Amino acid sequence: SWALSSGEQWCERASPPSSSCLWEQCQLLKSTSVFARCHPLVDPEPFVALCEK
Amino acid sequence: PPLHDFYCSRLLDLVFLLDGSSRLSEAEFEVLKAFVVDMMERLRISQKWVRVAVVEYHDGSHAYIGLKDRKRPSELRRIASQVKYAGSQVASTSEVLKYTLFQIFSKIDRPEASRITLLLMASQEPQRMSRNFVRYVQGLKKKKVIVIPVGIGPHANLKQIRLIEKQAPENKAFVLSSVDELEQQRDEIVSYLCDLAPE
């Protein structure tokens, strides 16, 4: 809904990619000591979820 | 003479358990030393009112200041700031608990005050070394001792935390994510300790 078509470029409805998705290093956001300092400020759950994706 | 705002000038017996595992880096261990120094700075440090003892455990107790020691509080500050960084690969909560139960608090001579142990865990003791953990916690409970676990780091064993609380009415856990939170919660911790004031 926020696409801005130009004269030479015309917007087309973008759709979610048609694809199908163990490293698991994303756990560092909640396991490493340095990262965990942020847990009081910002919840790492969304970030780790995006990392899993 | 309170340095900034607080002076818990009441009969008390206090022991610290600065962790010596490698999980707390050199800077983190220095922050912990700053915590303990700034903590005792706001207490009436004297055998008459407050007894302070720092016991670094790196798989073996390394008591630098004993609760029986009688020296100038400035000297105690200096010693606390001078606690060396062990940097051991594995600490032992059970070992330090046994040390405090048998060799530090086993010869009651001042019931006027209370017994409080600040277990500042920052690493997971191997399960093979946790055979007598509950036994020592209960034994300290019999001796009128309140254990205040502090889960400093993310690796701080949390199963033992709230398990010390489970086997006691007053055992309160202060689970933190980093040593930085110690400065934030210093006032809260000293307040909580002074709620259980022996007067």
The range of the structural domain enclosing residue B144 comes to 1-199
* Tokens describing residue B185: 């919660």
Asked if B43 and B81 touch (Cβ cutoff 8 Å), the reply is: no
User: How many domains, in total, are found in chain B?
Assistant: 1
Q: What is the DSSP letter of B63?
A: E
Q: Nearest chain B Cα to A41, which residue?
A: B177
Cβ of A33 under 8 Å from any chain B Cβ?
yes
Task: For residue B150, give the amino acid letter.
Answer: V
Cβ of B180 under 8 Å from any chain A Cβ?
yes
Experiment type: cryo-EM
What CA dihedral angle connects B153, B156, B159 and B164, to 10 degrees?
-90
Q: What is the DSSP letter of B19?
A: B
Radius of gyration (C-alpha) of chain A in whole angstroms = 18
- Tracing tokens 């009651």 back to the chain, one arrives at B108
The reported resolution of this PDB entry, expressed in Å, is: 3.2
Cβ of B181 under 8 Å from any chain A Cβ?
yes
What is the distance between the alpha carbons of residues B186 and B124, in angstroms, rounded to a whole number? 24
Q: What is the DSSP letter of B55?
A: E
- Tracing tokens 């970030």 back to the chain, one arrives at A47
